[PDB]
Amino acid sequence: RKIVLPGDLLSTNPRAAGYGTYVEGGKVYAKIIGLFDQTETHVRVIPLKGRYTPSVGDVVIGIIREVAANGWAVDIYSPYQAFLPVSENPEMKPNKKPNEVLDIGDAIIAKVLNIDPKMKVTLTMKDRICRPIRFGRIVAINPARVPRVIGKKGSMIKLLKSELDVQIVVGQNGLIWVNGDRRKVSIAEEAIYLIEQEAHTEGLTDRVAEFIKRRKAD
Amino acid sequence: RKIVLPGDLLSTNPRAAGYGTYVEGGKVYAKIIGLFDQTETHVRVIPLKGRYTPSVGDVVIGIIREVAANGWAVDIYSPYQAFLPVSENPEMKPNKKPNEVLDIGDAIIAKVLNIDPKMKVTLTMKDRICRPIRFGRIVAINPARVPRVIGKKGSMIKLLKSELDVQIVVGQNGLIWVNGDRRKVSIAEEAIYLIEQEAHTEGLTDRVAEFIKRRKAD
Amino acid sequence: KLIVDGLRLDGRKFDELRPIKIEASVLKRADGSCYLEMGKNKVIAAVFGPREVHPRHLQDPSKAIIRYRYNMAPFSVEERKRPGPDRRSIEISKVSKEAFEAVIMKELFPRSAIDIFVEVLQADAGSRTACLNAASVALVDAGVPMKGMITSVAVGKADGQLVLDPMKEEDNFGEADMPFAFLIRNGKIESIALLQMDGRMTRDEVKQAIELAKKGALQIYEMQREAILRRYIEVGEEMDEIT
Amino acid sequence: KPEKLIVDGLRLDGRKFDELRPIKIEASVLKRADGSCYLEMGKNKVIAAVFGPREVHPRHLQDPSKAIIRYRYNMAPFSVEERKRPGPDRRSIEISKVSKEAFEAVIMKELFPRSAIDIFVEVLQADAGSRTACLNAASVALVDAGVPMKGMITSVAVGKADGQLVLDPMKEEDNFGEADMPFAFLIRNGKIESIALLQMDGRMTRDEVKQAIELAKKGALQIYEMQREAILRRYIEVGEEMDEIT
Amino acid sequence: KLIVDGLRLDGRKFDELRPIKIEASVLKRADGSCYLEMGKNKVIAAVFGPREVHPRHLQDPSKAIIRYRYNMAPFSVEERKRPGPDRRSIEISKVSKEAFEAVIMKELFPRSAIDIFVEVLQADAGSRTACLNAASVALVDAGVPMKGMITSVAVGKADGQLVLDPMKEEDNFGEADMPFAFLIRNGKIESIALLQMDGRMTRDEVKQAIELAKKGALQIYEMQREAILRRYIEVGEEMDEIT
Amino acid sequence: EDILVDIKRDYVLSKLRDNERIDGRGFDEFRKVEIIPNVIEKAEGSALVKLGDTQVVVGVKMQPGEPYPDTPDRGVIIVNAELVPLASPTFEPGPPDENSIELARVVDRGIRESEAVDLSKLVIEEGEKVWIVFVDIHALDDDGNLLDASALAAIAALMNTKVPAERFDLGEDYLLPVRDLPVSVTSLIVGNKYLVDPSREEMSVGDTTLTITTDKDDNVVAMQKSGGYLLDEKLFDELLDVSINCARKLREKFK
Amino acid sequence: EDILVDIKRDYVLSKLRDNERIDGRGFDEFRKVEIIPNVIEKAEGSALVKLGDTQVVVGVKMQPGEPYPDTPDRGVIIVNAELVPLASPTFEPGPPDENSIELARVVDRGIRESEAVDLSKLVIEEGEKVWIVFVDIHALDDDGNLLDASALAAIAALMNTKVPAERFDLGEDYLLPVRDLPVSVTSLIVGNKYLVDPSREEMSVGDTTLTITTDKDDNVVAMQKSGGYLLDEKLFDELLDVSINCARKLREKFKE
Amino acid sequence: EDILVDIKRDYVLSKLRDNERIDGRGFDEFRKVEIIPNVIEKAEGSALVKLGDTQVVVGVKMQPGEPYPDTPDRGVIIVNAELVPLASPTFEPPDENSIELARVVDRGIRESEAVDLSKLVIEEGEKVWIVFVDIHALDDDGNLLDASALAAIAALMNTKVPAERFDLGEDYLLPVRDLPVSVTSLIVGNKYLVDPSREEMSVGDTTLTITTDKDDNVVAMQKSGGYLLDEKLFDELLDVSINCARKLREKFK
């Protein structure tokens, strides 16, 4: 699968155009560096770098920035602002005041519900994986490095979830949540940071297992 | 009772640390200049200087600064901000709006209901003494000078109230409300200010008597 | 005499660029970066992707604002320069800022800012031009949406003959200096993003200059591609494997 | 220009190696400030003012979890032999920075969120150590202003003249010595608790540095009783008034 | 000698103004404007009606704030002037601004700002005075509410004798210069809005100076009325026809 | 932020689609020009120019001074501009902005690159004294295209400058010898269309322009593209010639 | 203290209605004045003056320099003020305000227009070296009327200045030749009433003042109206005389 | 970023508690150092220094000029820094920090007398050599101070006096007699982290710098940040610092 650069003519039919591309004069062009992704239904460009641009359905871990009676302003770690409406947090029973369920500084994992034209992002917690982070730990790594900690078919997180018997929810924005035996949760942190700095991803899956190995020793 | 300075050792038992002190290394030290009061419940330091720092139960005189539905924002003249909710103003009725009860400029007399972790002070007017001021006059003295104006065991304001047949309410923040017959209020006013500037206070109460007379005669 | 027997001082032909070297992703704390050498020019560009513009009054509600800063190190000139902007620095920053405003897809980031910092460590003729080429690579390197790439070079005029990428002696004694910047899409010159000119030229020499310029721009364009791809072959493969 | 700064065991101004210069301290001298102090240290004449926790206004510098501390050292144009152009200079800004940090380590800013404590110190007449003198003054003003502090801050410098370490150096020892090292400690119940300020310029050995600290610690305690006396003396009356009322 | 044979250098008597020419409304993009010539002074005033003050912290919640700026073009003096404000421009701006603060009903426009700009294209003695008279007309032309008109003129003291509207020679070699500005309603001096004095005067000379100044002010006042009325005949008629 | 811009912007774009300018003039026609020299008697040189309802004054001041350490054989010309807040409600009161600085640089490039003033002819002492020419541009009314109005005004002011020799006891006064006549033509570029000599209202569309400066023999001597937009090479080819033709017509007013 | 000013502003106004002043002084009497020379030994001249509870320090420094190409037969006097944050919470900790500039200028006009220093006696070398006198004002406590307090400190400091000739090898040190005593009298104007030497609390009514400076022979050498208000010509006529008188009593203090 | 630095901050603190650094370094070891001279041919002297991923370039420009009235027999050395916004989005387009960074560098060079200024005189009270040392941050990943100090002395050592250019004779090396080296440590409680990284710094800007000369004498010291320094810790870090400087001093042989 070939690499393309902004300005590169990708396709001749604009109705197939998706992420990372743009249309002008009946032609489709790439607007970001990345892998060319063309199928029968679409023509896209898979990103390699940049900051987190959210898309409908993404799981994300956020920090409540501001409180309101209609909801909360949540920080996604992206140039796009987000807000969780009171109507979308099932843990808040009517009689409760918004500042009794979630307050400034608290952590939560939600889902990208909707992205309006003005670029606002509406968050929701009405889902299985979603939940308030009352306990555990948070890890933050570059978003462009997220697909690497998850790996091919989830092979990386699996190694981590399994080999350390810890709970892990990787947010697309680069914020990750880990829970379990404190001794084991720390090893997870260490390994995720190594994976993030890793300059050469040759047999990274194997080196990580060898790290969690020696690391479990002490 | 001697004067202690910040950093002075007051007690070895930290279960006794009271107002104006702090615990470090399992010991109690004074943090402000003041009178060391030794009792058998606390090891406090009565302050002698500084800006006003409210405490639950204080009767303070504030001024309306901002208007809203949830309540009123009031300046009590201190580094701590204060708010008067609608839920705590007896005169408040569901009929008319809050705007028609108190405007961005009125003077009230209230009690400090609660001061939370963020140093946000919550006021209340649901008290026998509380009432919106719309009569008399307001005098303002330095808060560190209010214990002199009240005098020993209330000695002082009792002397003022009686010899001048005047109504007086000393706020802790330093704002005092005086009411009565124009001419008598003016003399009480004058006396309070002169009491605030007094250089030597040994025999101040009798001296204020000869003043209440000389001004009541001539 | 600048031109002697079809040759310029440095020794090259009228239609030849000076030696160029380009390197992407060289700074760790920047969202995007590029080191670039264009003759005796040594420049380094960094970019800090769509971020929160804190001085709230300069916050656009419908698109991102673009800030570009051109700056010379006090040691990049023959004679030590006092640090700080000058009227020249401010004008270069402005025209460069506009070159990317025309190419960046600012509508994608309301209330945010994209700051572009460019420093010339050692100067010679065309640093302005060296810097634009480095900024373009740095912007791609940070992953900010653009309509295409921006390539820049200048045309001069010595002994009455148009020359590509003029050197110092040529800019100091020639009859004209004309820096250009083009938007390039899929190996073709689309339109111009920057055009400035000081000198004395005929209507006919200006058109020729655009042609000479376009020829040099495409050459630099292939070096920009090679620099980027070279630097990205590995992550591309990794992503391809994972995805 | 000077030869032999330490002649016959004595310095040019006549004192021994371990003695401070004459000192005068006055608390509560300004009316408009929340706290203030007048302090003389040698030819030094400095004045400190403190503006109690006040509401910081440009809400972009306002910290939401604690008070921010501001300190500004400034020399009056007439404080030095040659008239000094009014305005901050690189060294003024640095002294102000190092001094601010010195108090951030002692003031309990956690008690005044969104507020600011401004400390302004002006040197009306300069001599060596004007920077140490200001801190000593600043400490008293803060106390006098009622701001909560872990303890008191006392400062003094140690110089090195003709191989000899000297307390509170004078202009000559500073302008022709081999080292100048200003210190500042947090003192509690008459005990040097820890270091708050430390800077050195010159040439010293690992062994001389350690000797400077002990030299500095002795002078510091001396200056610390002068700070107490100045304070107590000033407050004896009001203290008694409060004990009679309270 | 300054005053020889009862007459002054420029040839006028002690109680006479220099030539004056006023033109109301001369700027198209201003809210109000005025071109004023007083002696060798060529100054122009522009006012920008109650607008929103933007650096939000300067915004006064119960009334309009007034901002005045006196400025001299670098080519208005004998020796080219380095552009920008100096200490006396700052004081002239402050004092002039206080004069209008006492006449404009700024209480009608809370949170708003009324900006008055005055530029001296050619400077002579009394420019301070010329600008005030110009600004006063621009304020009326801008349609902002006022208690009345403000008129200004200065009184110098040459050879121990008081003179109205001193010229440069009298300012540079006299014994005193005293600028005034009064509020004038129905052709009557109501009170003083600006007062400043430099020199050496006797308690009686001061008292007479006020008298001399009031005389010149009414004269300048009628010129201010002529200028404005002349200019408004047309729109006035237009409006009288519609209404 | 907005006042009447979008409404006026929508209107200007609306009529553009019909290939008309709101004032009805052609895409290659300037507004009426008035050049009035000698207006600031206290200046060595001076001129006021009216380009439509747009107005600007330029003052030329001269005083001997020392030359730069690289051109002792050359006099000095310093051009600066003040887009005073009195010219328009948008002009901020303070130091020069990016716009003030850029308008001055262009005015400065056409005079210098066309060598309208022989700087070698302004030396008094090889490496000690030479004449210093200050060209100060002062905006009075901004109704569009202050740049061109300034360029015309600047050169008109130089052409009427009188060297103050006698004032410095350096000889007898004389006219600044001007050998060329730079003129600049600024156009607003809206898409694939251009508008010569844009107005304040037309500018509501955006600050996207192209300025070309010519000398008396019709040679290009200075060019400057401004604003964040893309310039079609074919529009440039057309505007270049149109610009050279417009500069030629304007150069006639100086007769 | 948005209203805290209004609280005492009301008191001041309250008693103004009854035609009395807050601390009991008369509408034409200054608070107790105190002048103290030689407080900054390192300076060539200085003086500290306490006016009521207000305090100011002025220091004078001299050094030879080049004269103004226009006045090669005279010395140079420069006046500057630093209304430093030290004096009050309203004093912004930055460069010269619009108020420091005006204060220094008034003080400068009084000294310059009354010819208090014989500048012609400070020439060292016609057109080359001349003495340059720096007068720097420094507020310490702002309790109202820093201006008058400053004017007094300024001459008091000049009267204690010693030309430092020895230091610059130009001979023996000597008294700076002072030949007059400028004195300023500031009054707070409220409606048709004036308060001479207003205090910080009285200033609460507004910043509407009038300043008059006189010389030793009682002539007016400088006047400044400040604040945005209209001045009644009558009040001004009465005030003019009251100020000249007050100025004379203060000038007495200079006979030591 | 408040939390993002808080997240990492908590990570660093969390590991400090267990007595370990996040990159496995010992509490007294510097990251890898690379010193490359002559990177700016147009300068009289220059040096690029890499301390881990931290990068800095120092340029030395020399030219004749008039000396300080109080010292007509000594050349002049002026040090300045540009902690430009590249490689640290916290830098804004001089900081209160650039000043202190340049100041510390300056002090080391001046106190150790690394440059015999007396030998740069050209004419007693007129012409003297002015040496401009300009620091330029390229990539900030912690401790730009120590990296800048290494780059500064290195550039001076590669400095070549441009005598010919100014017709004052043959060119020659700048006289350098000493080797200032500073060592900065992060201080958290009663623990110290020598040569802190951008991440470790997230804990707070509370440091302590010490500079020594070739003979191991202390020539400058600078305590920074709002914290309290324990005397025992200071007495231990004193020796630790002098030892680290000595090892780094070996990279110059």
Query: Burial, F63: exposed, middle or buried (Cβ in 10 Å; 0-12, 13-18, 19+)?
Result: middle
User: Strand, coil or helix: what is E2?
Assistant: coil
The answer to whether E137 touches E45, Cβ cutoff 8 Å, is: yes
- Nearest CA among D93, D221, A145, E78 for reference residue C242: A145
Residues of chain B contacting G14 with CB distance shorter than 8 Å: 137
Residues 6 or more apart from F89 whose CB is under 8 A from it?
E29, E48, E51
Residue B24 phi, psi (nearest 5): -150, 135
Q: Does G2 touch chain D (CB under 8 A)?
A: no
The answer to whether A80 touches A53, Cβ cutoff 8 Å, is: yes
- How far is residue C196's CA from residue C194's CA, in Å, rounded to a whole number? 7
- How far is residue E87's CA from residue F52's CA, in Å, rounded to a whole number? 37
- Nearest CA among F209, F247, F207 for reference residue F225: F209
Residues of chain C contacting A73 with CB distance shorter than 8 Å: none
The dihedral formed by the CA atoms of A98, A101, A104 and A105, expressed in degrees to the nearest 10:
-170
Residues of chain H contacting A61 with CB distance shorter than 8 Å: none
Residues 6 or more apart from B197 whose CB is under 8 A from it?
none
Query: Burial, H162: exposed, middle or buried (Cβ in 10 Å; 0-12, 13-18, 19+)?
Result: middle
Query: Burial, D97: exposed, middle or buried (Cβ in 10 Å; 0-12, 13-18, 19+)?
Result: middle
Alpha helices in H112-230 (DSSP H): 144-157
Inter-chain residue contact C83 with H80, CB threshold 8 Å: yes
Mutation target among H68, H111, H179, H233 for the D interface, most CBs of D within 10 A: H111
Q: What are the DSSP calls for chain B, one per residue?
A: --EE-TT-EEES-GGGB-TTEEEETTEEEE-SSEEEEE-SS-EEEEE-SSS----TT-EEEEEEEEE-SSEEEEE-SSSS-EEEEGGG-TT--SSS-GGGT--TT-EEEEEEEEE-TT--EEEE--SSS-EEE-SSEEEE--GGGHHHHH-GGGHHHHHHHHHHT-EEEE-TTSEEEEES-HHHHHHHHHHHHHHHH-S--TTHHHHHHHHHHHHHH-
The answer to whether E116 touches E93, Cβ cutoff 8 Å, is: no
Inter-chain residue contact G88 with D72, CB threshold 8 Å: no
Q: Does H132 touch chain C (CB under 8 A)?
A: yes
Q: Does A152 touch chain C (CB under 8 A)?
A: yes
- Tally the residues of chain G: 256
Beta bridge partners of A169: A177
Which two tokens mark G2?
Answer: 């948005």
- How far is residue D11's CA from residue D5's CA, in Å, rounded to a whole number? 6
**Nearest chain F CA: its distance from E75 CA (Å):** 6
Inter-chain residue contact H219 with D202, CB threshold 8 Å: yes
- How far is residue F200's CA from residue F185's CA, in Å, rounded to a whole number? 16
Domains of chain B by range and CATH? 1-48 (2.40.50.100), 49-135 (2.40.50.140), 136-218 (3.30.1370.10)
Inter-chain residue contact C192 with F225, CB threshold 8 Å: yes
Inter-chain residue contact G41 with D43, CB threshold 8 Å: yes
The dihedral formed by the CA atoms of C91, C92, C95 and C99, expressed in degrees to the nearest 10:
-160
- How far is residue A148's CA from residue F193's CA, in Å, rounded to a whole number? 49
Residues of chain G contacting D72 with CB distance shorter than 8 Å: 85, 93
Q: What is the CATH number of domain F5-255?
A: 3.30.230.70
**Nearest chain F CA: its distance from C99 CA (Å):** 6
- Nearest CA among C175, C182, C218, C212 for reference residue C197: C175
Q: How many other C-beta atoms lie within 10 A of the C-beta of residue F53?
A: 16
The dihedral formed by the CA atoms of D14, D17, D22 and D27, expressed in degrees to the nearest 10:
170
Q: What angle do CA E94, E98, E102 make, to 5 degrees?
A: 170
- Nearest CA among E22, E23, E9, E125 for reference residue E77: E125
- How far is residue F231's CA from residue F212's CA, in Å, rounded to a whole number? 14
> Where do we find the tokens 């509408």?
G27
**E strand residue ranges, chain C:** 20-24, 32-38, 41-52, 65-72, 112-122, 149-158, 161-164, 176-185, 188-201
Residue H124 phi, psi (nearest 5): 5, -85
Helix (H) or strand (E) holding F248: helix F233-250
- Tally helices (H) and strands (E) across chain E: 4, 9
Q: What angle do CA G39, G43, G45 make, to 5 degrees?
A: 70
Beta bridge partners of F223: C197, F212
Structure obtained using: X-ray
**Nearest chain G CA: its distance from E229 CA (Å):** 27
Residues 6 or more apart from B154 whose CB is under 8 A from it?
none
> If you ran DSSP here, which 8-state letter would residue A153 be given?
G
Which two tokens mark A87?
Answer: 């109507």
- Tally the residues of chain F: 255
Instruction: Tell me the CA distances in angstroms from A172 to A120, A168, F30, G191, one per residue in order.
Output: 17, 13, 57, 70
DSSP β-ladder status, E65-72 and E32-38? unpaired
Looking at residue B65, its amino acid is R
CA B71 to chain centre: 23
The answer to whether D157 touches D169, Cβ cutoff 8 Å, is: yes
The answer to whether G136 touches G82, Cβ cutoff 8 Å, is: yes
Count CB pairs under 8 A between chains D and G: 85
Which two tokens mark E36?
Answer: 């004023």
Residues 6 or more apart from E66 whose CB is under 8 A from it?
E97, E100, E101, E104, E106, E113, E114, E116, G228
Nearest CA in chain F to E46: F86
Residue B152 phi, psi (nearest 5): -60, 130
- How far is residue C200's CA from residue F222's CA, in Å, rounded to a whole number? 8
Inter-chain residue contact E75 with F93, CB threshold 8 Å: no
The answer to whether F182 touches F110, Cβ cutoff 8 Å, is: yes
Instruction: Tell me the CA distances in angstroms from F206 to C64, E132, F31, G43, one per residue in order.
Output: 16, 37, 20, 61
Q: Does B24 touch chain D (CB under 8 A)?
A: yes
Inter-chain residue contact E94 with G98, CB threshold 8 Å: yes
**E strand residue ranges, G215-252:** 220-226
Residues of chain G contacting E116 with CB distance shorter than 8 Å: none
Q: Does C203 touch chain F (CB under 8 A)?
A: yes
Q: What angle do CA F33, F38, F43 make, to 5 degrees?
A: 130
Looking at residue F99, its amino acid is N
Query: Burial, D168: exposed, middle or buried (Cβ in 10 Å; 0-12, 13-18, 19+)?
Result: buried
Looking at residue E45, its amino acid is A
How many angstroms separate the first and last alpha carbons of chain C? 60
The answer to whether E121 touches E73, Cβ cutoff 8 Å, is: yes
**Nearest chain A CA: its distance from H136 CA (Å):** 26
Inter-chain residue contact D146 with B33, CB threshold 8 Å: yes
The domain G5-256 is classified under which CATH number: 3.10.450.50, 3.40.50.300, 3.30.230.70, 3.10.580.20?
A: 3.30.230.70
Inter-chain residue contact G109 with E206, CB threshold 8 Å: no
Q: Does C243 touch chain A (CB under 8 A)?
A: yes
Residues of chain F contacting E119 with CB distance shorter than 8 Å: 84, 86, 138
- How far is residue H81's CA from residue E184's CA, in Å, rounded to a whole number? 60
The answer to whether G52 touches G201, Cβ cutoff 8 Å, is: no
Of B77, B105, B189, the CB nearest to G4: B77
Q: Does C29 touch chain A (CB under 8 A)?
A: no
Longest dimension (CA), chain B: 63
> If you ran DSSP here, which 8-state letter would residue F67 be given?
P
F partners (3+ CB pairs within 8 A) are C, E
Count CB pairs under 8 A between chains C and H: 84
- How far is residue B38's CA from residue B60's CA, in Å, rounded to a whole number? 28
Q: Does H56 touch chain C (CB under 8 A)?
A: no
- Nearest CA among E119, E126, E32, E40 for reference residue F137: E119
**Nearest chain A CA: its distance from H150 CA (Å):** 27
Nearest CA in chain C to H80: C83
The dihedral formed by the CA atoms of G99, G105, G106 and G112, expressed in degrees to the nearest 10:
170
- How far is residue H236's CA from residue F180's CA, in Å, rounded to a whole number? 77
Q: How many other C-beta atoms lie within 10 A of the C-beta of residue B31?
A: 24
Helices D206-245, D130-144: axis angle to 10 degrees equals: 30
Which residues of chain G are at the B interface, by a Cβ-Cβ cutoff of 8 Å?
1-4, 7-8, 10-11, 14
Residues 6 or more apart from F250 whose CB is under 8 A from it?
F30, F33, F152, F183, F185
> If you ran DSSP here, which 8-state letter would residue F52 be given?
T
The answer to whether E1 touches E160, Cβ cutoff 8 Å, is: no
Residues of chain D contacting G80 with CB distance shorter than 8 Å: 77, 86
Which two tokens mark E45?
Answer: 């005033």
Q: What is the CATH number of domain D18-246?
A: 3.30.230.70
- Tally the residues of chain H: 253
Q: Does H222 touch chain D (CB under 8 A)?
A: yes
Radius of gyration of chain H (CA): 19
The answer to whether C140 touches A5, Cβ cutoff 8 Å, is: yes
Q: Does H238 touch chain D (CB under 8 A)?
A: yes
Longest dimension (CA), chain D: 62
**Nearest chain F CA: its distance from C61 CA (Å):** 9
- How far is residue H102's CA from residue H137's CA, in Å, rounded to a whole number? 12
Which two tokens mark F127?
Answer: 């490496």
Q: What angle do CA E223, E229, E234 make, to 5 degrees?
A: 150
Residues 6 or more apart from C80 whose CB is under 8 A from it?
C74, H61, H63, H132, H134
Nearest CA in chain D to G81: D86
Q: How many other C-beta atoms lie within 10 A of the C-beta of residue D17?
A: 14
Which two tokens mark D85?
Answer: 């152009």
- How far is residue D187's CA from residue B6's CA, in Å, rounded to a whole number? 10
> If you ran DSSP here, which 8-state letter would residue G232 be given?
P
Sheet strand arrangement including C161-164: C161-164, C149-158, C176-185, C188-201, F220-226, F209-214, F183-190, F193-196
- Nearest CA among C173, C176, C184, C179 for reference residue C219: C184
Instruction: Tell me the CA distances in angstroms from G70 to A38, E75, G126, one per residue in order.
Output: 82, 21, 12
Inter-chain residue contact H4 with A77, CB threshold 8 Å: yes
User: Strand, coil or helix: what is F115?
Assistant: coil
Inter-chain residue contact D114 with B81, CB threshold 8 Å: yes
User: Strand, coil or helix: what is F136?
Assistant: strand
- How far is residue A47's CA from residue A54's CA, in Å, rounded to a whole number? 13
- The domain locations on chain F are 5-255
- The domain locations on chain E are 15-243
- How far is residue A19's CA from residue F85's CA, in Å, rounded to a whole number? 46
- How far is residue E20's CA from residue F255's CA, in Å, rounded to a whole number? 34
Q: What are the DSSP calls for C31-96, one per residue?
A: SEEEEEEETTEEEEEEEEEEEE--SGGG--SSS-EEEEEEEE-TTSSSS-PPSS--HHHHHHHHHH
Q: Does B200 touch chain D (CB under 8 A)?
A: yes
> Where do we find the tokens 């109460």?
B205
Looking at domain E15-243, its CATH class is alpha beta
Q: What does this entry list as its resolution, in Å?
A: 2.7
Instruction: Tell me the CA distances in angstroms from G226 to A80, D108, E92, G91, G153, one per residue in order.
Output: 52, 43, 12, 19, 21
- How far is residue A190's CA from residue H15's CA, in Å, rounded to a whole number? 10
Count CB pairs under 8 A between chains B and G: 18
- How far is residue F99's CA from residue F106's CA, in Å, rounded to a whole number? 11
The answer to whether G80 touches G66, Cβ cutoff 8 Å, is: no
DSSP β-ladder status, F33-37 and F45-51? antiparallel
Inter-chain residue contact A79 with C50, CB threshold 8 Å: yes
Q: Does C135 touch chain A (CB under 8 A)?
A: no
Looking at residue B31, its amino acid is K
The answer to whether F79 touches F108, Cβ cutoff 8 Å, is: yes
SS (H, E, C) chain D: CCCCCEECCEECCCCCCCCCCCEEEEECCCCCCCEEEEEEECCEEEEEEEEEEEECCCCCCCCCCCCEEEEEEEECHHHCCCCCCCCCCHHHHHHHHHHHHHHHCCECHHHCCCEEEEEEEEEEECCCCHHHHHHHHHHHHHHHCCCCECCEEEEEEEEEECCEEEECCCHHHHHHCCEEEEEEEEECCCCEEEEEEEEEEEEECHHHHHHHHHHHHHHHHHHHHHHHHHHHHHHHHHHHHHHHHC
Dihedral sign for Cα G89, G94, G95, G98, please. negative
Instruction: Tell me the CA distances in angstroms from A147 to A152, A165, A202, C240, one per residue in order.
Output: 8, 21, 15, 11
Instruction: Tell me the CA distances in angstroms from F139 to B149, C72, C90, E196, F144, one per residue in order.
Output: 65, 32, 21, 32, 11
Inter-chain residue contact D199 with H222, CB threshold 8 Å: yes
Which two tokens mark A177?
Answer: 């949540």
Q: What are the DSSP calls for A17-54, one per residue?
A: B-TTEEEETTEEEE-SSEEEEE-SS-EEEEE-SSS---
- Say which CATH architecture domain H5-253 belongs to: 2-Layer Sandwich (3.30)
User: Strand, coil or helix: what is H87?
Assistant: coil
Longest dimension (CA), chain G: 64
Q: How many other C-beta atoms lie within 10 A of the C-beta of residue E222?
A: 11
D partners (3+ CB pairs within 8 A) are B, G, H
Beta bridge partners of F156: none
Q: What angle do CA G217, G218, G221 make, to 5 degrees?
A: 100
Mutation target among C121, C127, C131, C168 for the H interface, most CBs of H within 10 A: C121
Residue E161 phi, psi (nearest 5): -110, 140
In chain E, residues 41-100 whose CB comes closer than 8 Å to chain G? 66, 87-88, 90-91, 94-95, 97-100
